[PDB]
Design a protein around this nucleic acid. Structure first.
Lengths: 94, 93
DNA sequence: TGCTTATCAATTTGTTGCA
DNA sequence: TGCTTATCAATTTGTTGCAC
């Protein structure tokens, strides 16, 4: 499923124009990236959460020269799937 | 930012009602979950992708009893943030 | 787009049951 | 989403640059 296909399904499910599903979806994703980038957590009950995670510096190694090197500290976006998402993907047994 | 707060923000940018932002967002999340649960990859240009990952069985331990246990194989949802998302969080160079 | 070095290395997550 | 086990064990990601 791409963005186009998702819009198709959404426009159908929510009874909005394929434009509007696209309009609202694009703004939603753009907003999530914005909130995460300025360090807010985006929380969507059942689905999951998105946040920025700190990554400390660590050592790597150059595969060409074998030289040890330092990967500097960074931040990365992170997703944690909510309980409904996890259980649809893996229906509980025990 | 929670669901209710994201919907408010998106009704504004797209120029709809709150009720349409919400019904669109809800539909989109349910569709992604369904797509992923059925083994489909959801790929959204300018945001990232969602997919199912296989996890082999592994060893854990019971905190109540201290007995070793086997956590069975399963499937888990995974998100891979797109380049744009990654670069907004951590500007290059 | 893979695939790629290190006898890597910082990281995530799951395991009970109750609050 | 907390604390609460293992002197856990499995994941992921990154390090460079080619065409494997």
């Amino acid at each position: 499923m791409n963005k186009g296909e998702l819009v198709d399904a959404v426009a159908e499910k929510a009874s909005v124009t394929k434009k509007q599903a696209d309009a609202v979806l694009t703004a939603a994703l753009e907003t999530i990236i914005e909130a995460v980038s300025s360090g807010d957590k985006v929380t969507l009950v059942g689905f999951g959460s998105f946040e920025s995670r700190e990554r400390k510096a660590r050592e790597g190694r150059n595969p060409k020269t074998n030289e040890k090197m330092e990967i500097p500290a960074t931040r990365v976006p992170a997703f944690s799937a909510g309980k409904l998402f996890r259980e649809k993907v893996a229906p509980p047994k025990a």
